[PDB]
């Protein structure tokens, strides 16, 4: 209907050319106020603090994805030069001869924010390697039939964990507590995005359909989009609102905010968004980060008072 957001600040002329897996915010330095970390296609590793650019750094290769365990960690080829506030800290490499497709995080035990963390990686060979809370070593190597296109983790490493994996073949696979399911869901097109929601996983296939899936295989709802999917992301507001939404941006230029079946906000960036991040950046908790095809950076913020009901 209308857009719920507050317009923070806009930089039409950032250098940034990156898509979602190469964008991230974390507290690398620890002075409370969080920083935006981007693995550009410049093979340059830009860092933004607040309204301004802080650093640039040089990246050996062109990057695949960046995560954090306060230690940033770019992936590329078969190496993962995990930096750390903010200078090289390892060059851990995959035992068999492998190329990296995807990477994400897992909670170590607390299943709560700002806790101990275990890095996770998918390999073109067909494995998902979960590692140590110091990034020390492979903790569970699970070999799985298909090439992973992208992945999502819901859970805790100690308590319980379910990981959802979208393969390039157009199938959705599941792993619960290190154990691999034989439950295989067939998609309608090859997957474009994967989001961990409340009680289900969201796939976006190329035919402009978002789909909701439960670990069992039930299809909860289906979102049918007017244009093509360029971006998807878990927007997670905690507090008395407690909703775990889905933002999806399209090439026609709109950025939509579905709350389960329902649309809650739509705004349009002048150029198509390629990257979406929702989280604490700056001192404000609910903030939306967009990197567009015009290479501009846009920061928007969710009012305390906005109802997503």
């Amino acid at each position: 209907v209308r857009s719920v957001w507050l317009d923070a600040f806009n930089d039409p002329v950032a250098g940034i050319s990156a898509y979602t897996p190469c964008v991230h915010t974390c507290n690398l330095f620890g002075d409370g106020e969080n920083r935006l970390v981007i693995a550009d296609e410049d093979r340059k590793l830009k860092i933004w603090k607040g309204t301004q650019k802080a650093s640039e750094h040089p990246l050996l290769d062109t990057p695949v994805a960046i995560c954090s365990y306060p230690a940033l960690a770019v992936a590329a080829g078969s190496h993962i030069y995990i930096y750390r506030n903010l200078r090289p800290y390892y060059k851990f490499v995959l035992p068999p001869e492998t190329v990296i497709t995807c990477m994400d995080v897992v909670k170590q035990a607390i299943d709560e924010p700002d806790a101990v963390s275990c890095l996770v990686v998918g390999t073109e060979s067909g494995r998902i390697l979960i590692l140590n809370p110091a990034g020390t070593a492979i903790v569970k190597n699970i070999w799985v039939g298909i090439t992973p296109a992208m992945i999502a983790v819901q859970g805790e490493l100690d308590v319980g964990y379910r990981i959802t994996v979208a393969g390039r073949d157009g199938k959705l696979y599941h792993i619960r507590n290190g154990e691999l399911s034989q439950t295989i869901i067939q998609l309608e097109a090859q997957p474009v995005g994967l989001v961990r929601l409340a009680k289900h996983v969201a796939v976006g296939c190329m035919n402009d359909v978002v789909h909701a899936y439960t670990p069992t295989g039930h299809k909860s709802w289906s979102l049918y989009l007017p244009c093509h999917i360029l971006a998807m992301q878990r927007m997670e507001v905690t507090g008395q609102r407690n909703t775990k939404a889905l933002i999806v941006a399209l090439s026609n230029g709109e950025v939509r905010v579905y709350n389960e079946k329902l649309l809650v906000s739509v705004h349009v960036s002048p150029n198509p968004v390629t990257a979406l991040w929702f989280g604490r950046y700056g001192r404000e908790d609910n903030t939306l980060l967009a990197i567009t095809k015009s290479g501009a950076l846009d920061i928007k913020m969710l009012p305390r008072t906005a109802n997503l009901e």
Binding site: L6, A8, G50, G282, R283, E284, I299, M301, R304, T305
Partner: protein, 166 residues
Amino acid sequence: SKKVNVLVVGLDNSGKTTIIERLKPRPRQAAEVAPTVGFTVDEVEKGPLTFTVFDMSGAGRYRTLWEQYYREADAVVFVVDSADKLRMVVARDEMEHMLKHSNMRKVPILYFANKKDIPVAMPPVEIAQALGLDDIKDRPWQIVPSNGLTGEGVDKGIDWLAERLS
């Protein structure tokens, strides 16, 4: 003497607890001042007036509390971190609501555009154009640049408030 109620709101980390510490006597002052938790109530004397001062927290988590004092308050001091260009809008929203409320009477609002010393500071005319203070047409208001650390301007400000509170 005469006592009046002053509420001090503002986003987190703007220097409300610091700005009120410079109103307290040099001996009663705290050395390292801490992130206000919940809220804190000091009394400060300046002239015929004796200020009943309310220091709120600014973190989102507690903003739900500012509404608690809007009825009794006789004046509002709104503090703004000048280096935080980012969360300028978030300040505006919180300020809009505070005015909008039905319990907040049309009292004088003194705005401190604090942290003028910081290099990247936002200048008193850009700040009040973000916050849109030019629109405020029903009450006396003034923006004053400042430095909470030092007390710089804090005099220039409270003196103003005290004037229309008399």
